[PDB]
């Protein structure tokens, strides 16, 4: 048993809810919250900015020190940092950004990072301002992630569309 509530079960291991991932993280305090990061860990908008804002910029301070030491991530890659006041850990995962011209085939590599964690709270990688088709991102998630993933979909209209089209 775990603490996630009101999710719709899609498969053996994938669950989904219409929820603000920030509000969800604050309530559940999951072991792992996934950030939809970029390779620079510059948390400007979307899930990265919202999460970072909820940490009072501590996520961005930590991230700047990580980049100063290690250099940028790879598209498709990840790193584990603090979850601050939101979670034990934050898994910063870089999905391809279609609005920057990155290869959508890297989305499967991005979701493979989730398999290193038994349970995660996550957004739909490469959806929203990342420019990929969220229906596609949900299908890659289901077909790639084998660990237990709780997907928060911010937009109510998108949530309804994802559920109604899910095979
Ligand atoms: O939750 C959703 O309605 C769809 O996902 C997203 C919405 C807006 C911004 C996003 C940025 C990164 C990844 C997903 C995002």
Rounded distance from Cα 129 to ligand 1 centre (Å) = 6
DSSP for residue 31: S
The 3-class secondary structure across the chain, one letter per residue, is CCCCCCCEECCCCEEEEECCHHHHHHHHCCCEEEEECCCCCCCCCHHHHHHHHHCCCHHHHHHHHHHHHHCCCCCCCEEEEECCCCCCEEEEECCCCHHHCCCCCHHHHHHHHHHHCCEEEECCCCCHHHCCCHHHHHHHHHHHCCCEEEEEECCHHHHHHHHHHCC
Rounded distance from Cα 138 to ligand 1 centre (Å) = 12
For residue 159, the ligand 1 atom closest to its alpha carbon is: 3
The answer to whether the beta carbons of residues 109 and 139 sit under 8 Å apart is no
Cα 155 to Cα 35, 68, 75, 124, distances in angstroms? 17, 34, 25, 11
Q: What is the resolution of this structure in A?
A: 1.0
Rounded distance from Cα 124 to ligand 1 centre (Å) = 6
3-state percent helix, strand, coil for the chain, nearest multiple of 5: 40, 20, 40
Compute the distance between CA of residue 47 and CA of residue 135 in angstroms, rounded to an integer. 18
What are the tokens at 30?
């999951």
What are the tokens at 161?
């569309």
**Which residues are within 8 A (CB) of 66 and not within 5 positions of it... i.e. 6 or more apart?**
41, 79, 81
The answer to whether the beta carbons of residues 36 and 47 sit under 8 Å apart is yes
**CA-closest residue to ligand 1 atom 8:** 128
CA angle 37, 104, 49 (to 5 degrees): 20
Q: Which domain holds residue 91?
A: 1-167
Compute the distance between CA of residue 26 and CA of residue 38 in angstroms, rounded to an integer. 23
SS3 149: strand
The answer to whether the beta carbons of residues 19 and 153 sit under 8 Å apart is yes
Q: What are phi and psi of 83, to 5 degrees?
A: -90, 0
The pocket around ligand 1, CB under 6 angstroms, is made up of 36, 46-47, 123-124, 127-130, 134, 153-155, 158
Residues in a beta bridge with 8: 16
For residue 126, the ligand 1 atom closest to its alpha carbon is: 13
What are the tokens at 69?
């030491």
Compute the distance between CA of residue 21 and CA of residue 154 in angstroms, rounded to an integer. 7
The gap from C-alpha 94 to its chain's centroid, in whole angstroms, comes to: 9
Counted domains in the chain: 1
Best of 130, 136, 151 to mutate for ligand 1, by most ligand atoms within 8 A of CB?
Answer: 130
């Amino acid at each position: 048993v775990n603490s996630f509530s009101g999710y719709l079960k899609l498969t053996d291991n994938v669950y989904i809810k219409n929820a603000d991932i920030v509000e969800e993280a604050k309530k559940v305090k999951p072991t792992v919250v996934v950030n939809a990061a970029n390779v620079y860990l510059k948390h400007g908008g979307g899930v990265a900015g919202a999460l970072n804002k909820a940490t009072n910029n501590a996520m961005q301070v930590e991230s700047d020190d990580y980049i100063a030491t290690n250099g940028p991530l790879k598209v498709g890659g990840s790193c584990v940092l603090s979850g601050h006041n939101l979670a034990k850990h934050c898994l910063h995962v870089v999905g391809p950004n279609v609005n920057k011209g990155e290869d959508i085939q890297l989305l499967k590599s991005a979701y493979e990072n989730f398999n290193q964690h038994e349970v995660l709270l996550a957004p739909l990688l490469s959806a929203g301002i990342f420019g990929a088709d969220p229906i596609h991102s949900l299908r890659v998630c289901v077909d790639t992630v084998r660990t237990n993933v709780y997907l928060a979909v911010f937009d109510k209209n998108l949530y309804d569309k994802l559920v109604s089209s899910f095979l």
